């Protein structure tokens, strides 16, 4: 085989950072639909038996403090760790309400050598955020382990590209992620679930805009896996 041990007493924490409203001075628009995302994620990960903590509208300082504190917790009885980030972003960056934070700064708290009670355990970062401003036009039809090991980043969109969010339905990616988990978490390995999420976002969604520049656009999520074993939620 080659599977993460997922029968610790607890599945682990699921931290959801939901940034909807940004400081006026940043000029960043309000992210209508993100509360739908946040509620969907809470219910989805609850059914997977994660301990969910929802946080809304955090400053860049509060995001860093939160991640630092959570990485200092004793995770010894937890199988895994999940962090979901819902916000504006750019490549390598997620936005607090008042400015940017480096994603590398956040994940570094959970390095194999800095968070020892998560060493050897899967650390999942799920990110709904832009990675740039490109638009996809689509086309018709001792033994040691590395300190960067056992991270997985499920990004909503490909490097360099905008990510799409529907103000009524929530983001394309989170919508699809939650549906695929609900349907397949009891039968498929995580990478295969995320591949179905890739499939769903790529094929079932397309932008509608009165603005020709932004109309009829497509999206493909991006899985970045540094996992060393298969991950099952059953």
């Amino acid at each position: 085989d080659n599977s993460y041990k997922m029968d610790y007493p607890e599945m682990g924490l699921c931290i959801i950072i939901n940034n909807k409203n940004f400081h006026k001075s940043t000029g960043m628009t309000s992210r209508s639909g993100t509360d739908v995302d946040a509620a969907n994620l809470r219910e989805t990960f609850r059914n997977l038996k994660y301990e969910v903590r929802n946080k809304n509208d955090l400053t860049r300082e509060e995001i860093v403090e939160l991640m630092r504190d959570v990485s200092k917790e004793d995770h010894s009885k937890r199988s895994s760790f999940v962090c979901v980030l819902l916000s504006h972003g750019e490549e390598g960056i997620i936005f607090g309400t008042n400015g940017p934070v480096d994603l590398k700064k956040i994940t570094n708290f959970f390095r194999g050598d800095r968070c020892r009670s998560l060493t050897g355990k899967p650390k999942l970062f799920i990110i709904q955020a832009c990675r740039g401003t490109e638009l996809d036009c689509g086309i018709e039809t001792c033994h040691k382990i590395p300190v960067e090991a056992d991270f997985l980043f499920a990004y909503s969109t490909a490097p360099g590209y905008y990510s799409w969010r529907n103000s009524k339905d929530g983001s394309w990616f989170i919508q699809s992620l939650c549906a695929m988990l609900k349907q397949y978490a009891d039968k498929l390995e995580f990478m295969h679930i995320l591949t179905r999420v890739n499939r769903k976002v790529a094929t079932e969604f397309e932008s509608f805009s009165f603005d020709a520049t932004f109309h009829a656009k497509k999206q493909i999520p991006c899985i970045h896996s540094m996992l060393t074993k298969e991950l099952y939620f059953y």
Partner: peptide, 4 residues
């Protein structure tokens, strides 16, 4: 539909 809006971008992030």
């Amino acid at each position: 539909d809006e971008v992030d």
